[PDB]
Design a protein around this motif. Structure first.
Motif, mmCIF file in Angstrom:
data_model
loop_
_atom_site.group_PDB
_atom_site.id
_atom_site.type_symbol
_atom_site.label_atom_id
_atom_site.label_comp_id
_atom_site.label_asym_id
_atom_site.label_seq_id
_atom_site.Cartn_x
_atom_site.Cartn_y
_atom_site.Cartn_z
ATOM 1 N N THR A 227 -14.359 -49.496 54.060
ATOM 2 C CA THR A 227 -13.986 -49.655 52.660
ATOM 3 C C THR A 227 -12.613 -50.302 52.527
ATOM 4 O OG1 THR A 227 -13.149 -47.368 52.626
ATOM 5 C CG2 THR A 227 -15.386 -47.743 51.799
ATOM 6 N N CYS A 228 -12.388 -50.978 51.406
ATOM 7 C CA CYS A 228 -11.115 -51.644 51.155
ATOM 8 C C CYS A 228 -10.525 -51.204 49.818
ATOM 9 C CB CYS A 228 -11.300 -53.163 51.167
ATOM 10 S SG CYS A 228 -12.883 -53.726 50.465
ATOM 11 N N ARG A 229 -9.283 -51.603 49.566
ATOM 12 C CA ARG A 229 -8.603 -51.250 48.326
ATOM 13 C C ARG A 229 -7.633 -52.349 47.904
ATOM 14 N NH1 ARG A 229 -6.038 -49.073 52.541
ATOM 15 N NH2 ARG A 229 -3.745 -48.959 52.538
ATOM 16 N N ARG A 230 -7.773 -52.811 46.666
ATOM 17 C CA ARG A 230 -6.911 -53.862 46.141
ATOM 18 C C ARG A 230 -6.503 -53.563 44.701
ATOM 19 N NH1 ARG A 230 -6.053 -55.416 50.797
ATOM 20 N NH2 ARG A 230 -4.299 -54.114 50.095
ATOM 21 N N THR A 231 -5.198 -53.588 44.444
ATOM 22 C CA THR A 231 -4.677 -53.318 43.110
ATOM 23 C C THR A 231 -3.683 -54.391 42.680
ATOM 24 O OG1 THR A 231 -4.545 -51.069 44.033
ATOM 25 C CG2 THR A 231 -4.151 -51.321 41.665
ATOM 26 N N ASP B 142 -9.695 -58.022 48.323
ATOM 27 C CA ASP B 142 -9.506 -57.357 49.607
ATOM 28 C C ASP B 142 -10.235 -58.105 50.719
ATOM 29 O OD1 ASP B 142 -12.050 -56.636 48.568
ATOM 30 O OD2 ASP B 142 -11.210 -54.731 47.863
ATOM 31 N N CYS C 283 -16.381 -57.625 51.129
ATOM 32 C CA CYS C 283 -16.070 -56.688 50.056
ATOM 33 C C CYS C 283 -15.400 -57.404 48.887
ATOM 34 C CB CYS C 283 -15.161 -55.571 50.573
ATOM 35 S SG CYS C 283 -14.340 -54.613 49.259
ATOM 36 N N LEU D 284 -14.068 -56.921 45.018
ATOM 37 C CA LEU D 284 -13.715 -55.989 43.953
ATOM 38 C C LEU D 284 -13.086 -56.723 42.773
ATOM 39 C CD1 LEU D 284 -10.415 -54.138 44.939
ATOM 40 C CD2 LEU D 284 -11.082 -56.478 45.522
ATOM 41 N N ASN E 30 -6.298 -48.643 41.201
ATOM 42 C CA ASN E 30 -6.132 -48.555 42.647
ATOM 43 C C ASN E 30 -7.463 -48.248 43.329
ATOM 44 O OD1 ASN E 30 -2.884 -48.289 43.360
ATOM 45 N ND2 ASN E 30 -3.422 -47.662 41.271
ATOM 46 N N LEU E 31 -8.549 -48.362 42.572
ATOM 47 C CA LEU E 31 -9.882 -48.099 43.102
ATOM 48 C C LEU E 31 -10.115 -48.870 44.398
ATOM 49 C CD1 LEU E 31 -12.176 -48.013 39.938
ATOM 50 C CD2 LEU E 31 -11.721 -46.152 41.546
ATOM 51 N N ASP E 32 -11.119 -48.449 45.159
ATOM 52 C CA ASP E 32 -11.448 -49.101 46.420
ATOM 53 C C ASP E 32 -12.746 -49.896 46.298
ATOM 54 O OD1 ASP E 32 -10.060 -47.295 49.204
ATOM 55 O OD2 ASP E 32 -9.341 -47.358 47.127
ATOM 56 N N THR F 123 -16.276 -51.928 47.891
ATOM 57 C CA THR F 123 -17.366 -51.590 48.798
ATOM 58 C C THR F 123 -17.701 -52.761 49.715
ATOM 59 O OG1 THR F 123 -18.277 -50.672 46.734
ATOM 60 C CG2 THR F 123 -19.417 -50.125 48.792
#
Length: 70
Positions: A21-25, A35, A43, A45, A53-55, A57
């Motif tokens: 999983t990744c996270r990009r804000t 991400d 992935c 997003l 700050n959600l992650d 998929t």
């Protein structure tokens, strides 16, 4: 045929993908943050002005590589 697996196997088996999983804000930037993901899976997003700050998929790619070796 021979004892070689490649000599008897014309098509190579597909490799499994990772569920990493990744996270990009991104705030007060106005630019969408993307991400990164490993090979075989990507992935993506998307987060509008209400981004968080959600992650993100990851999904496995159906497209088979050019590898001949099992």
């Amino acid at each position: 045929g021979p004892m070689e697996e490649a000599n008897t196997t014309p098509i190579s088996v597909k490799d499994q993908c990772a569920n990493v999983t990744c996270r990009r804000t991104v705030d007060n930037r106005g630019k969408r943050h993307i991400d990164g993901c490993p090979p075989g899976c990507l992935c993506v997003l998307k987060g509008p002005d209400s981004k968080d700050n959600l992650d993100g998929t990851c999904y496995l790619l159906a497209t088979t590589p050019k590898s001949t070796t099992t």
